[PDB]
Amino acid sequence: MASGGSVIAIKYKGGVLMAADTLLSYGSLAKWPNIPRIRLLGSHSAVCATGSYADFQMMAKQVEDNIERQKMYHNVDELSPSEVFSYLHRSIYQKRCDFDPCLCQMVFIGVRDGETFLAGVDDVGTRWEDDCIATGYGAYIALPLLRQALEKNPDGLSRGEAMRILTDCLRVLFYRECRAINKFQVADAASDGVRISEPFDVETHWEYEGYCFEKTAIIR
Amino acid sequence: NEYDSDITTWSPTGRLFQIEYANEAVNNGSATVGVKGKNFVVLAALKRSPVAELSSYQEKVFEIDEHVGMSISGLVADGRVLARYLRTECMNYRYMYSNGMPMNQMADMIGEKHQRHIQCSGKRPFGVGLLLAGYDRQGPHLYQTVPSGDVYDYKATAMGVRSQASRTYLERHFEHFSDCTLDELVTHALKALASATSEGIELNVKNTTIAIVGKDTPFTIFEEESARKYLD
């Protein structure tokens, strides 16, 4: 029951960013705060899951292997991101049909030849593609903010604006998602392939005047 | 020949006669040619030509998915088995990855299917040769396959009866095919296919199929409207 919390992603002009805390929880217990939850798949894609890490790990191994073997064994071009995503989605669905569900929601990103790809898949095989995507509490807390940033920049976001807004959301998830930590990694998919950032933290604000002891006291 | 009755029997010179005999099935099917340009692959198959006013279709050429299809020679019923197999493997692949099965992987497969039928008692070699033409991210492809399980990646080829002459023809012209247009690829195929006709028979819309496949061109068997254009 090691589980991973929110993932969020957004397309910028040029690429995709995906971000996640580096934390696996076990119920309420914050168990491992140094888990690299984002995982590269092939040369152009990365994936990250909310939910059962064990499911995630088994699913991500299945897909990584499929990719690597298809390519090593046949003189063929690596699978595109949509193709990998397709595979993963059908894999996840087949498992829901066997009553053996892969109990994660996943976000998937990838870039090939400046075509970008960002999708979400969920335990039952729902899948969807959008300019931003989130799972877990990301979907409740960050999507509205990310969506708002894409309404305001309908020409696409820059990498910096995108990373500014991603970061704004991480901070909000940090404040409002219980099972979270202020340590994040962000994968960036672009032309070149995908890089995962070193873990980083966001600045938090806790000193609003209304948070003071006198004001929040229940009894005067 | 004490050694030619079973697919599981090597001969003392290291031959497998049942496989050489399955090859004969292919050398005795109706001729088919394929050629590969920069962007396109053309299959042309001789059919069987009217017995007076008295026709006769057999399906030689098969579409297999949008991006690939094939021409067979030899035991047509084996053709159909292989066609069913390829079709099915291509749909599974397209179901899973939402894109066409790449040709080098499909050639690997069709060759593994053949091998599965040349090593155990009571299976037998497919008595059918395939030209498989298809187009993917790596460009156009043309494979010939044979009962033995071998798969050749060709630039041009022919097989079936009198197809040695089709191969003589193709050997003169094949180095140009990478520059030719679709119309000259088709011309070149038809020319080659005709070097394989018996004496004074000639090519026409009712003893010749043409399929093409290539860039932005799903695999397409040509019917009597579009074929006529190319056959004159």
Please name the member of A73, A77, A90 whose beta carbon is closest to the beta carbon of B95: A90
The DSSP 8-state label assigned to residue A139 in this structure reads: I
B94 CB-side CA count, 13 A: 14
Mutation target among A62, A70, A74 for the B interface, most CBs of B within 10 A: A74
Which residues, including other chains, have CB under 8 Å from residue A140's CB and lie 6 or more apart? none
How far apart, in Å, are the Cα atoms of B127 and each of B1, B25, B65, B148, B199?
Answer: 21, 5, 23, 9, 27
Distance CA(A187)–CA(A165), nearest Å, equals 15
Sheet holding B139-145, edge to edge: B61-65, B68-74, B128-136, B139-145, B151-153
Total length of chain A: 220
A79: nearest CA in chain B?
B97
> Are A57 and A46 spatial neighbours (Cβ–Cβ below 8 Å)?
no
Instruction: Tell whether B109 is within 8 A of chain A (Cβ).
Output: no
Which residues, including other chains, have CB under 8 Å from residue B218's CB and lie 6 or more apart? B66, B67
The DSSP 8-state label assigned to residue B231 in this structure reads: -
Rounded to a whole number of angstroms, the distance from the CA of A199 to the nearest CA of chain B is 33
The CA-to-CA distance between both ends of chain A, in Å, stands at 43
| Method of elucidation | cryo-EM
Tokens of B116: 């599965």
Q: Which secondary structure element, helix H or strand E, spans residue A132, and what is its range? A: strand A132-135
Sheet holding B208-214, edge to edge: B156-159, B32-36, B40-46, B208-214, B217-221
Residues of A with CB under 8 A from a CB of B: 70, 73-77, 79-80, 82-84, 86-87, 90
Q: What are phi and psi of A52, to 5 degrees?
A: -60, 115
> Are A179 and A28 spatial neighbours (Cβ–Cβ below 8 Å)?
yes
How far apart, in Å, are the Cα atoms of B132 and each of A126, B78, B117, B124, B126?
Answer: 36, 15, 19, 21, 15
* 3-class SS of residue B45: strand
> Are B93 and B129 spatial neighbours (Cβ–Cβ below 8 Å)?
no
> Are B136 and B102 spatial neighbours (Cβ–Cβ below 8 Å)?
yes
Exposed / middle / buried, residue A153 (Cβ in 10 Å: 0-12, 13-18, 19+): middle
Among residues A101, A103, A88, A91, the alpha carbon closest in space to that of A41 is found at A88
B97: nearest CA in chain A?
A83
Tokens of A25: 């929880």
Among residues B157, B222, B218, B134, the alpha carbon closest in space to that of B183 is found at B222
Please name the member of A74, A75, A86 whose beta carbon is closest to the beta carbon of B97: A86
Which stretches of chain A are DSSP H helices?
Answer: 53-73, 81-97, 143-152, 159-176, 213-216
Rounded to a whole number of angstroms, the distance from the CA of A71 to the nearest CA of chain B is 9
Angle (nearest 5°) at CA B30 between B25 and B33: 110
Mutation target among B92, B98, B141 for the A interface, most CBs of A within 10 A: B98
Pairwise CB contact (< 8 Å): A86 & B102: no
* 3-class SS of residue A186: strand
Please name the member of B97, B104, B138 whose beta carbon is closest to the beta carbon of A83: B97
